């Protein structure tokens, strides 16, 4: 209706449009800022792993050979004892008859 | 002492040494085992970021040409409002 009430009108919408401007920068920054240190956590988390994950096959080929040793040496002590039974049971065969 | 004696105790060892051989290798098996459930948990994580992080590019980029285009549209906006107030402005001095 009156002119002056037109001006008014415009007068306010670009206050309002400004204010949602600048509010709206705030928002998208501070969810922005969450986003990186959120990236960033789980880069620095990432790169640890994957650290831990190249190690491995030198670890593992260390282990395997401790392990061949052990083995052998389970193996060994298994069969001199088994080998003992046996000669022994044998002494005393000859022996019983 | 009497062999008798001797092939007992020898069966004792030997009985013994069996089984701690195998208790041994039950537990270093279950060692090893346990380190290759982690590492392969920390895999699937880090996997499971890498995708995360490596369409980070791709979504900044779009998330930029949509923020540009609101920019765009904004500006706009504003020099619409403000040829409307010196418009009205200008109505509002010719009374």
Do not use: T, W
């Amino acid at each position: 209706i009156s002119e002056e009430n037109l001006l008014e009108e415009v007068e306010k919408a670009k206050v309002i449009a400004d204010e949602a401007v600048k509010l709206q920068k705030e928002i998208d920054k501070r969810c922005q800022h969450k986003i990186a240190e959120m990236v960033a956590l789980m880069e620095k988390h990432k790169h640890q792993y994957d650290k831990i994950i190249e190690e491995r096959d030198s670890e593992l080929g260390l282990y395997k050979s401790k392990e061949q040793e052990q083995s052998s040496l389970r193996a060994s002590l298994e069969i001199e004892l088994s080998n003992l039974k046996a000669e022994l049971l044998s002494v005393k065969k000859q022996l019983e008859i």
